[PDB]
Design an enzyme around this catalytic site. Structure first.
Site, mmCIF file in Angstrom:
data_model
loop_
_atom_site.group_PDB
_atom_site.id
_atom_site.type_symbol
_atom_site.label_atom_id
_atom_site.label_comp_id
_atom_site.label_asym_id
_atom_site.label_seq_id
_atom_site.Cartn_x
_atom_site.Cartn_y
_atom_site.Cartn_z
ATOM 1 N N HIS A 42 -1.577 2.519 3.260
ATOM 2 C CA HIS A 42 -1.771 2.795 1.837
ATOM 3 C C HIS A 42 -0.445 2.848 1.093
ATOM 4 O O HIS A 42 0.590 3.218 1.659
ATOM 5 C CB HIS A 42 -2.474 4.154 1.618
ATOM 6 C CG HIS A 42 -3.836 4.237 2.234
ATOM 7 N ND1 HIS A 42 -4.374 5.421 2.688
ATOM 8 C CD2 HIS A 42 -4.776 3.287 2.451
ATOM 9 C CE1 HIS A 42 -5.590 5.199 3.165
ATOM 10 N NE2 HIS A 42 -5.860 3.912 3.033
ATOM 11 N N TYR A 49 1.622 15.794 3.477
ATOM 12 C CA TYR A 49 2.492 14.788 2.881
ATOM 13 C C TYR A 49 2.876 15.199 1.471
ATOM 14 O O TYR A 49 2.017 15.558 0.663
ATOM 15 C CB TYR A 49 1.878 13.380 2.913
ATOM 16 C CG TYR A 49 0.526 13.132 2.296
ATOM 17 C CD1 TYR A 49 0.417 12.377 1.127
ATOM 18 C CD2 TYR A 49 -0.645 13.574 2.905
ATOM 19 C CE1 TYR A 49 -0.804 12.105 0.558
ATOM 20 C CE2 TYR A 49 -1.872 13.310 2.346
ATOM 21 C CZ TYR A 49 -1.948 12.573 1.170
ATOM 22 O OH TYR A 49 -3.168 12.303 0.604
ATOM 23 N N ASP A 98 -10.716 1.226 4.348
ATOM 24 C CA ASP A 98 -9.651 0.814 5.260
ATOM 25 C C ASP A 98 -10.111 -0.298 6.192
ATOM 26 O O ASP A 98 -9.296 -1.145 6.588
ATOM 27 C CB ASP A 98 -9.117 2.026 6.024
ATOM 28 C CG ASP A 98 -8.324 2.977 5.112
ATOM 29 O OD1 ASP A 98 -7.996 2.563 3.968
ATOM 30 O OD2 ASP A 98 -8.037 4.129 5.523
#
Ligand SMILES: [Ca+2]
Lengths: 183, 183
Positions: free
Chosen positions: A64, A134, A172
Site C-alpha cells: 500500500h 505505524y 489486496d
C-alpha cells in the site's frame, strides 16, 4: 544517547535499533527522537498520525501507498507478537527503484523500520496474533491510494509463511501488478 | 472518524478515547492525529520524542516535570499490563492549580492521557509488569527537572496500591514537598 539507524539495501530506508537501559525495576529506552533522526538523515522526522492494528496469524496486508503530495513516510514496529514487514522502493529516480527489503519486527526485538515516502509497504503476521504500530508523516487520503500486488512476479517477494496460510482482503487480492504502475 | 477528547477536572488535561473498528481478523484504530488534536484543543500537537519503559508491580515513578521553556506535554498510554497514572496542575495562573487527577491506563482499555506543559506526572504499575509509553512535545533537559513528592500531604493523591508495595527510586523518595515549589 546517539540514535542508531542501521542501513538497509533500499535508499533512505533505515532500521532504528534501540539503546535499552536495564535496571532493577525493568528497562527504559528512547524509542524515537525527531531531532536526532533529522540530524542523521536530512529527512522529515515530523510524524502526524499514529495507527494501531491487531490481526491473526497469516493476515497479510499490502502493498500500500498514497500517491503524490499525499505520500506517507511510515515508522513501523510490532508491539505484540511478530510480523514480517516488507518495503518496496517505487521512486523512478532512485538507484534502488523496484527493489524490496523485508525484516522481522517483534515485541521482543523492539526494532522500528522507517519506510520513506515513495515506497510501498506491507506486512504479514507470523505469530498467533500481532499488534502492529505505524506512524505516518502525512495524513490519510483515500482518493490518493495506490497499491502493488503483494505476490507480483517481478518483485518476487518472500512472504515467509506458506501461501495456503495467507489471508488477504479482496482489495489486496486484486491489486494491480507492479508493471501497471498504480503508484 | 472524529477524535474523542473527554474532559477531566484539570484544565487542558484530556482522555483520548479511541474509536476501535473490529473485524474478522482483529481490530484497527487511529491512535493519534495531530491535526484533529490541535483543532480540538488549540494546543501544540507536534510530539518530538517517544519513550518506553517496562517496570514491575509497585514501581512508582514521579511526580516529575521539566521547568520553564523545557516543559514537556506528555501523551501517555499503557501498551502491556495496567498502570495508575496521575497528573497535577502546577500552573500558578490556572483555575485548577494544585488539583490532581488519576486514572487507570491499560493495554485492554487503550486509553491515552494528555498531560499539558506546566503539570507534573507520575504512575504506578498495577499488574505484575507493565509497559508504559510516553510521547513528549519537548526534549529532555536534566538541568530543568522539577519534582513533587508523590505522597505530599497537601495533594493527598490516592495511588491505589498498598504503600508497603511501592518501589521508589532514591530521587523520588526525597523529592521536595508541593509547598517547597520545585517547579
Ligand atoms: Ca522537524
Amino acid at each position: 544517547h546517539h540514535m542508531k539507524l542501521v542501513k538497509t539495501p533500499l535508499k533512505d530506508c533505515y532500521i532504528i535499533e534501540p539503546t535499552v537501559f536495564e535496571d532493577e525495576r525493568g528497562y527504559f529506552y528512547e524509542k524515537y527522537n525527531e531531532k536526532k533522526f533529522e540530524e542523521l538523515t536530512g529527512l522529515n522526522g515530523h510524524f502526524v498520525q499514529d495507527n494501531i492494528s491487531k490481526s491473526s496469524y497469516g493476515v497479510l496486508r499490502g502493498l500500500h501507498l498514497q500517491k503524490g503530495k499525499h505520500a506517507q513516510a511510515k515508522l513501523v514496529s510490532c508491539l505484540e507478537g511478530r510480523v514480517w514487514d516488507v518495503a518496496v522502493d517505487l521512486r523512478e529516480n532512485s538507484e534502488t527503484f523496484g527493489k524490496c527489503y523485508g525484516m522481522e519486527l517483534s515485541a521482543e526485538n523492539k526494532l522500528q523500520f522507517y519506510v520513506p515516502r515513495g515506497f510501498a509497504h506491507g506486512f504479514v503476521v507470523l505469530s498467533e496474533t500481532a499488534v502492529f504500530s505505524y506512524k505516518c508523516d502525512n495524513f490519510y487520503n483515500k482518493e490518493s491510494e495506490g497499491s502493488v500486488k503483494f505476490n507480483d512476479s517481478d518483485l518476487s517477494i518472500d512472504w515467509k509463511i506458506p501461501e495456503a496460510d495467507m489471508i488477504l482482503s479482496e482489495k489486496d487480492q486484486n491489486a494491480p501488478a507492479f508493471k501497471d504502475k498504480n503508484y
